[PDB]
């Protein structure tokens, strides 16, 4: 629409017929990344009914991942605003840890190209592995602040950089790159 | 002219001319001036509530920048200008901003002219 | 119209200062509307007639002190118009017509000031 | 009773959105500045406080049962009392977050 | 002035150069505190952290605004105390600014 | 406008594309402006062709001062908005500068009456004069603040009241009146 | 109104007639306090037409007592505004006074239970009655708090509950409990 009103025929009629809005926002577009999908302003009513068949055909824990991991971004959206006005420095490690994990999902996982051939065409067996590792890093990071670990240490781990190299490789190298990348995480919070 | 660059935006600027047909620096110097101006039209309504003396160094420069932009860049009346003379104006105004506040151009562009 | 001709007769031609007081010029407008659309003529004053003008002209313009007569027709219209809209037909034309106006509101009617 | 007209009101209410949204935009970063600097003063405050609290009291508390008859002597040689009406130096200062007065002891 | 403190530490603020009218008379020194700030014929009024009023509303409602400060934290005793750094920092964060 | 809208075909085609477009508000005129104009929302298209005669006949700074008065009148609008947003909780020297000036300007220069021949009349010199008085008050005020002169005292100079008694002055008397008054401004500013 | 405003032609017509009006609002109605009536939304012209037959049958102090409830809730409109802009805890005592007079004018007197039958009955005796209950409380509390008491303590005092007896007391055993409790208002609150 040129702007779209919800009291315009076009908008309030369509809205009902389709099951998904895969909304992109302008703020997100200036940042020059595709996918630019603004998750808080997107929805797709399908998901529910697609969980059975997903783990049937695709892989075991694939649905389990997707629904679970979305929360990062959720529990970041309202967090950043004006509460973390200068970053967190007066804040607890509880609240710090969210933006450490926040860093890797939004600078590696959300970003992708479409003018580099190493990551314009992806597939499931690639995306799945990416997504698993970033769960497993929330799972060892939040466990880090109960051990006594600062974010200073987290910000120097080669793991963060390994997440960035798993999309600067393609689907063919993925097996070998998955071996090394995965096991690296487990031995990079058992060092801390 | 009254033309404000903020509501404006061409949908085609790369599918028209390219590099070397409008000088290569034109591209990124266009998204410098966008963000430099825009910042300052919001602290004109904070120029005397809190002031500009209670404001950061960076933001103080971003005021004066806007003012000189209307005077020299937008307005010129009926005087002519070329691509090259308009990019000239731009550089001078941008020298006032440090290299630390130049981040919307390439390293190539900063070392091209200040 | 009818009433005002018995004003003309007694102020002008029998020299007495007659006060005329007209009220319920909203019940007027109910009846005006009827002929508005039930007759051939079409609406043209945002859902009311367009020969409305004449209907509020012939009424108000009779009144006036005539120079050579001692006596006068002093008319006091009292409206009752729907809500406090000012785009409503009634206050519309009435405003323009009269010279000097008086309003009542609900600011001083919550205070008990009559 | 009081209901909004359509034709007259339209033009006011379209510019209402222009006026509001932009105003509030910059209203936002207006106070943000002031709280960032405020952390700086609250922290730095207590620096001198730990140092000088203890070295004041050092002597005080060690001059209580050797005082109560040398109270007289100590108050005599020293410079007489601070005025009870404005012994401190009050400063007035207009600033955002309303006109709040300050002072230095 | 007046400093409102413990009896023994109140003692050392009544000395010349300073003007104190301290001592404890309650657990938040209400007995004194209230009466004293009511006039506001002291250049400064200060309430320590060995008392400190749990209802600050009580004072404000009685003095009825003041252009001079009140309840400045002084430790109120010596025992090597310096917990009044981190304590005052959190005193700030709980009622205003960001949370935790 | 029959329906009370200033956005309709017949206003655009020939009632706003002409030499001058003007506007009226309802509580505006009631204070004391008879007739009243909106300071901003009102323009003139023709103004670049009326500059020759005004340059030569009146003065070579009559076109300069008339744009210069209009600037100040429409710049106050800048602050106007914020007043109705949450207000000034900080009055500064640069704040109330534009604001009070502009006040005086709307109080004496746009409150004129058409029922009185002392509040208006066709005369070059009255227009020229009044507009030079205001120029004076303005001029000095900018250099008052720098020195350390509170805007509060700026009100409390009697000379603001001298410019507030130029809108009653007899037409014939105005020349000698004006000349004696220009001196009082510059004396009750530089002294204080 | 089919549309949800009174701007509709079918509802503007029903407001061409005069006499008495009443206004039921969506917002009061939720709280299960029916009848829902607004003192800012109705007028009647049977107030002074009924004043003869009031001070003849009902009581002499009935043309008087009715005025004495109105003033309460007059000031409540004016102050409600102020309340939502800044709490009344910041405001002085006497501001909060009439606010909590007001509580009982809704809690136990705008709730006329259509499921309790001692509120389903109402008549002049239950009228006039509870009108003198409220009267007492008003004149006592105004003097009480000029002796330095705060409305805070008085909410805990038994006096607040006591006026609340209007739906815990009968219709046809009402003259037993009327006079009874009435006395304790002027008694046991100026002792306290």
From Swiss-Prot, chains A, F, G:
Family as reported in the entry's similarity comment: Belongs to the ATPase alpha/beta chains family.
Its function, per the record, reads: Produces ATP from ADP in the presence of a proton gradient across the membrane. The V-type alpha chain is a catalytic subunit.
The protein depicted here goes by the name V-type ATP synthase alpha chain
Species of origin reads Thermus thermophilus (strain ATCC 27634 / DSM 579 / HB8)
Span covered, complete protein: 386 to 577 of 578
Swiss-Prot record, chain C:
Origin, by domain of life?
Bacteria
Record keywords: ATP synthesis, Hydrogen ion transport, Ion transport, Transport
One GO term under biological process is: proton motive force-driven plasma membrane ATP synthesis
Q: In the UniProt record, does the keyword Ion transport occur?
A: yes
A single GO molecular-function term is:
proton-transporting ATP synthase activity, rotational mechanism
Its biological purpose is as follows: Produces ATP from ADP in the presence of a proton gradient across the membrane. The V-type beta chain is a regulatory subunit.
- Family indicated by similarity: Belongs to the ATPase alpha/beta chains family.
User: Can you say what this protein is called?
Assistant: V-type ATP synthase beta chain
This chain's source organism reads Thermus thermophilus (strain ATCC BAA-163 / DSM 7039 / HB27)
UniProt lists the gene as atpB
Curated annotation (Swiss-Prot), chain D:
Q: Which residues of the full protein are shown?
A: 2 to 106 of 223
Q: Tell me which domain of life the UniProt entry assigns to the organism this sequence originates from.
A: Bacteria
> What's this protein's family per the entry?
Belongs to the V-ATPase D subunit family.
Please state the gene responsible for encoding this protein: atpD
Name it: V-type ATP synthase subunit D
Q: What does this protein do?
A: Produces ATP from ADP in the presence of a proton gradient across the membrane.
Native organism is Thermus thermophilus (strain ATCC BAA-163 / DSM 7039 / HB27)
From Swiss-Prot, chain E:
- Recite the UniProt keywords alphabetically: ATP synthesis, Hydrogen ion transport, Ion transport, Transport
One Gene Ontology term of the biological-process aspect is:
proton motive force-driven plasma membrane ATP synthesis
Q: Which InterPro entries match?
A: ATPase_V1-cplx_f_g_su (IPR008218), ATPase_V1-cplx_fsu_bac/arc (IPR022944), ATPase_V1_fsu_sf (IPR036906)
One Pfam family here: ATP-synt_F
* Ion transport as UniProt keyword: yes
Q: SUPFAM superfamilies from the entry?
A: AtpF-like
Transmembrane intervals? none
- Single GO molecular-function term? proton-transporting ATPase activity, rotational mechanism
HAMAP family recorded: ATP_synth_F_arch
Family listed:
Belongs to the V-ATPase F subunit family.
- Job of this protein: Produces ATP from ADP in the presence of a proton gradient across the membrane.
Q: What is this protein called?
A: V-type ATP synthase subunit F
């Amino acid at each position: 629409p040129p702007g779209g009103d919800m009291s315009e025929p076009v908008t309030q009629s369509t809205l009902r017929i389709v099951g998904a809005f895969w909304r992109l926002d302008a703020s997100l577009a200036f940042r020059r990344h595709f996918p630019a999908i603004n998750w808080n302003g997107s929805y797709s009513l399908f998901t529910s009914a697609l969980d059975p068949w997903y783990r049937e055909n695709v892989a075991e824990d694939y649905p389990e991942l997707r629904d679970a991991i979305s929360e990062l971004l959720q529990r970041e959206a309202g967090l950043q605003e004006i509460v973390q006005l200068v970053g967190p420095d007066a804040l607890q490690d509880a609240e710090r840890l969210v933006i450490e994990v926040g860093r890797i999902i939004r600078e590696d996982f959300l970003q992708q190209n479409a003018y580099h051939e190493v990551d314009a065409y992806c597939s499931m067996k690639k995306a799945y592995g990416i997504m698993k590792m970033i769960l497993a890093f929330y799972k060892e990071a939040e466990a880090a602040i109960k051990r006594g670990v600062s974010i200073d240490e987290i910000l120097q781990l080669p793991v963060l950089e390994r997440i960035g190299r798993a999309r600067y490789v393609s689907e063919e190298e993925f097996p070998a790159y998955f071996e090394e990348a995965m096991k690296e995480i487990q031995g990079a919070f058992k060092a801390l | 002219p009254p033309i404000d660059p903020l509501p404006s935006l061409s949908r085609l600027m790369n599918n028209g001319v390219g590099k070397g047909k409008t000088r290569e620096d034109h591209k990124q110097v266009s998204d410098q001036l966008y963000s430099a101006y825009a910042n300052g039209v919001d602290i004109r309504k904070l120029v005397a509530i809190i002031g500009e003396d209670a404001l950061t160094e960076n933001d103080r420069r971003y005021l004066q920048f806007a003012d000189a932009f209307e005077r020299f860049f937008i307005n010129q009346g009926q005087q002519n200008r070329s691509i090259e003379e308009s990019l000239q104006i731009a550089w001078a105004l941008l020298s006032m901003l440090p290299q630390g506040e130049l981040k919307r151009i390439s390293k190539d562009h900063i070392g091209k002219y200040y | 119209r009818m009433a005002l001709t018995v004003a003309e007769y007694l102020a002008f031609e029998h020299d007495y200062h007659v006060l005329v007081i007209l009220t319920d010029m909203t019940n007027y407008c109910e009846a005006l509307r009827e002929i508005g659309a039930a007759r051939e003529e079409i609406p043209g004053r945002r859902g009311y007639p367009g020969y409305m003008y004449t209907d509020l002209a012939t009424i108000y313009e009779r009144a006036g002190v005539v120079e050579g007569k001692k006596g006068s027709v002093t008319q006091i219209p009292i409206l009752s118009m729907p809500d406090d809209d000012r785009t409503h037909p009634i206050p519309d034309l009435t405003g323009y017509i009269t010279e000097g106006q008086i309003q009542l509101s609900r600011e001083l009617h919550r205070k008990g000031i009559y | 009773s009081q209901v909004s007209p359509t034709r007259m009101n339209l033009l006011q209410r379209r510019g209402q959105l222009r006026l509001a949204q932009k105003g509030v935009d910059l209203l936002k970063k207006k106070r943000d500045a002031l709280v960032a600097e405020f952390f700086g003063l609250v922290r730095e405050a207590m620096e001198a406080r730990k140092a000088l609290d203890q070295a004041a009291k050092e002597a005080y508390a060690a001059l209580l049962l050797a005082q109560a008859f040398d109270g007289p002597e100590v108050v005599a040689g020293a410079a007489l009392g601070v005025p009870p009406l404005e012994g401190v130096e009050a400063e007035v200062e207009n600033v955002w977050g309303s006109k709040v007065p300050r002072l230095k002891a | 002035m007046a400093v409102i403190a413990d009896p023994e530490t109140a003692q050392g603020f009544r000395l010349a150069g300073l003007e104190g009218y301290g001592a404890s008379s309650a657990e938040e020194a209400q007995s004194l505190l209230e009466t004293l700030v009511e006039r506001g014929g002291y250049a400064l009024v200060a309430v320590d952290e060995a008392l400190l009023p749990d209802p600050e509303r009580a004072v404000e409602r009685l003095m009825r605004g003041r252009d001079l400060p009140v309840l400045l934290p002084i430790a109120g005793l010596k025992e090597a105390f310096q917990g009044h750094d981190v304590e005052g920092y959190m005193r700030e964060l709980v009622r205003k600014t960001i949370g935790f």
